[PDB]
Amino acid sequence: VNSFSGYLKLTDNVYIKNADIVEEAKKVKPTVVVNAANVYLKHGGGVAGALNKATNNAMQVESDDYIATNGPLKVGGSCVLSGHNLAKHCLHVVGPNVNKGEDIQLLKSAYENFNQHEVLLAPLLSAGIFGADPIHSLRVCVDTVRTNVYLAVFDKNLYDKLVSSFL
Numbered sequence: 001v002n003s004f005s006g007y008l009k010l011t012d013n014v015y016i017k018n019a020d021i022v023e024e025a026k027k028v029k030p031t032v033v034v035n036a037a038n039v040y041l042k043h044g045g046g047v048a049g050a051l052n053k054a055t056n057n058a059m060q061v062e063s064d065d066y067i068a069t070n071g072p073l074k075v076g077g078s079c080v081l082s083g084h085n086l087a088k089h090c091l092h093v094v095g096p097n098v099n100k101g102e103d104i105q106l107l108k109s110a111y112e113n114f115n116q117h118e119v120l121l122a123p124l125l126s127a128g129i130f131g132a133d134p135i136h137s138l139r140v141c142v143d144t145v146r147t148n149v150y151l152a153v154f155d156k157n158l159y160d161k162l163v164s165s166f167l
């Protein structure tokens, strides 16, 4: 039993809800919140910009030190950093950004990072400003993640389409 509330069960382990991931994280304080990161951990907009703003820019400061030490992530890769005031940990995961010409096949590799954590709050990878089809991202999530994932979808119209079209 966990404290996630109001989710629709899609499979044994994947759940979905219309919600602002920032407001969800603040309420639940999950062990892990997933950020929709880029390789430079520059959290300027989308999920990343919103999560960082909610930390009063502490996420960005921590991320800049991470990059200075380790260099950029790989597309499809991840790193674990602090969750600040939102969660215990933040798993920064880089899905492919179609608007940069990045290979969508790397979306499965990105979701594989979730399997290293027993329970996660997350957005759909490569959706939004990363330009991929959110229906496809949900399919890859369901077919790749085996741990318990609670997906927050910000747009109510998109949420209803993902549910009504889900196979």
Ligand SMILES: OCC[C@H](CO)Nc1ncnc2[nH]ccc12
Binding pocket: 019, 020, 021, 022, 046, 047, 050, 122, 123, 124, 125, 127, 128, 152, 153, 154, 155, 158
């Ligand atoms: O699930 C990823 C794609 C959705 C499309 O609505 N974007 C978001 N979902 C949840 N929380 C969010 N906060 C800021 C953006 C955002």
Ligand SMILES: [Cl-]
Binding pocket: 046, 047, 127, 128, 129, 130
């Ligand atoms: Cl977005």
